[PDB]
């Protein structure tokens, strides 16, 4: 409890095909305000930079979406928003690291200067 992996490691495990957050730990959940049983079935992006459109866009081709844009991005230090709304800038990095037998997309949110 003096680093990050146990301090407040925002770990969101999802599928790479359609996403859908499989489960989340007591750290990541703490970051926003969900949990493996409170955010499951939905998409992490729903609780990041605009829960209306941006979520459905960033979940597509990913990256800038338009290559060289700042409209919808979810794989870099961006400004996210929690269920309660905090619009706090954090670092986001999505990558397929698997977890069982399917390419599992993982996202780790790290508070800036925190």
Curated annotation (Swiss-Prot):
Q: Where in the cell is it found?
A: Cytoplasm; Nucleus
Source domain of life is Eukaryota
Q: How is it modified after translation?
A: Autophosphorylation is activated by phospholipids.
Residues annotated as domain PAS: 8-67
Q: In which tissues is it expressed?
A: Ubiquitously expressed, with slightly higher expression in brain, prostate and testis. Reduced expression was found in placenta. Present in germ cells of testis and in the midpiece of sperm tails (at protein level).
Which family is this protein grouped under?
A: Belongs to the protein kinase superfamily. CAMK Ser/Thr protein kinase family.
Q: What is known of its domains?
A: The protein kinase domain mediates binding to phosphatidylinositol.
Instruction: Quote the function comment for this protein.
Output: Serine/threonine-protein kinase involved in energy homeostasis and protein translation. Phosphorylates EEF1A1, GYS1, PDX1 and RPS6. Probably plays a role under changing environmental conditions (oxygen, glucose, nutrition), rather than under standard conditions. Acts as a sensor involved in energy homeostasis: regulates glycogen synthase synthesis by mediating phosphorylation of GYS1, leading to GYS1 inactivation. May be involved in glucose-stimulated insulin production in pancreas and regulation of glucagon secretion by glucose in alpha cells; however such data require additional evidences.
Name used for this protein in its record: PAS domain-containing serine/threonine-protein kinase
Q: Which organism is it from?
A: Homo sapiens
């Amino acid at each position: 409890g003096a680093m990050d992996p146990e301090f407040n490691k925002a770990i969101f495990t999802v599928d790479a095909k359609t996403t859908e957050i499989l489960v989340a730990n007591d750290k990541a959940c703490g970051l926003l305000g969900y949990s493996s049983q409170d955010l499951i079935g939905q998409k992490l992006t729903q609780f990041f930079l605009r829960s209306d459109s941006d979520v459905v866009e960033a979940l597509s081709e990913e990256h800038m979406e338009a290559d060289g844009h700042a409209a919808v991005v979810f794989g870099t230090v961006v400004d996210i928003i929690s269920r309660s709304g905090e619009k706090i800038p954090v670092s986001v990095w999505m990558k397929r690291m698997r977890q069982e037998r399917r390419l599992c997309c993982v996202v780790v949110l790290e508070p800036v200067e925190r």
